Amino acid sequence: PQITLWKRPLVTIKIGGQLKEALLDTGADDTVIEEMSLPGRWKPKMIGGIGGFIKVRQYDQIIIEICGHKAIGTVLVGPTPVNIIGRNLLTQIGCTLNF
Amino acid sequence: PQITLWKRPLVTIKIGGQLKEALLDTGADDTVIEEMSLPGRWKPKMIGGIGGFIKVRQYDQIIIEICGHKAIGTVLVGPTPVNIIGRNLLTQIGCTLNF
Numbered sequence: 001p002q003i004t005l006w007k008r009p010l011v012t013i014k015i016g017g018q019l020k021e022a023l024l025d026t027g028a029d030d031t032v033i034e035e036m037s038l039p040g041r042w043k044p045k046m047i048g049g050i051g052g053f054i055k056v057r058q059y060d061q062i063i064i065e066i067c068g069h070k071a072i073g074t075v076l077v078g079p080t081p082v083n084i085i086g087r088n089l090l091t092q093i094g095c096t097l098n099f
Numbered sequence: 100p101q102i103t104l105w106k107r108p109l110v111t112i113k114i115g116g117q118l119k120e121a122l123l124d125t126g127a128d129d130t131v132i133e134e135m136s137l138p139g140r141w142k143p144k145m146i147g148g149i150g151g152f153i154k155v156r157q158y159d160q161i162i163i164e165i166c167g168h169k170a171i172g173t174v175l176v177g178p179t180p181v182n183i184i185g186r187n188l189l190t191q192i193g194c195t196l197n198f
């Protein structure tokens with residue numbers, strides 16, 4: 001399937017037993033999700049961009065379901081204005097940019 | 100081309116006769132470039148990033164070449180961690196997400 005970019009490329013994911021809407025974000029190194037509980041150890045991280053930085057909790061080896069694809073990777077949890085699926089998981093589902 | 104996401108999707112762009120590095124960023128609605136001189140009048144725009152909202156300068160109908168593909172459209176100028184090619188211009192060059 002091909003996704004055009006006339007609008008934000010949003011998809012539904014399942015993470016930690018919850019459904020969430022998230023943006024397929026090629027500019028994002030990492031996957032970043034709004035506040036929620038995840039299992040396991042975590043460590044703090046700062047990530048930044050336009051408007052400054054936010055503090056997030058880094059969880060590793062988290063399983064996410066994206067469009068029927070199961071993938072495992074790191075998830076950063078914190079006060080992001082939008083849930084985003086970053087390259088660390090986009091690679092796992094074979095997502096590419098094409099033009 | 101087809102661009103995988105194991106590394107940041109950095110490409111060369113040309114704007115104002117000069118080559119710059121920029122990121123193909125499906126999570127950015129707009130195109131944001133580091134401080135440079137562009138022609139014409141600008142107008143104000145507020146954009147929201149990961150850390151909050153900021154004011155940038157909006158220039159319209161700016162010629163910009165992205166990986167050799169010619170685009171003409173809105174370019175915002177302001178403090179950004181990297182030059183960002185957002186959906187407004189990704190759509191112009193026919194860029195899609197595929198998996």
Ligand SMILES: NC(=O)c1ccc(S(=O)(=O)N(Cc2ccc(C(F)(F)F)cc2)[C@H]2CNC[C@@H]2NCc2cc(O)cc(O)c2)cc1
Pocket residue numbers: 025026027028029030031032047048049050084086122124125126127128129130131146147148149150180181183185
């Ligand atoms: N309205 C818009 O057009 C617009 C919206 C948001 C932004 S942004 O916040 O600056 N930005 C871009 C970004 C790209 C690359 C980097 C890098 F420096 F880490 F490489 C930071 C931020 C977002 C937009 N898409 C990628 C990035 N996502 C947030 C993010 C930041 C980060 O440091 C690490 C991550 O894993 C994820 C910019 C523009």
Ligand SMILES: [Cl-]
Pocket residue numbers: 072073074088089
């Ligand atoms: Cl990862």
Ligand SMILES: [Cl-]
Pocket residue numbers: 094103
């Ligand atoms: Cl691959």
Ligand SMILES: [Cl-]
Pocket residue numbers: 171172173187188
């Ligand atoms: Cl435009």
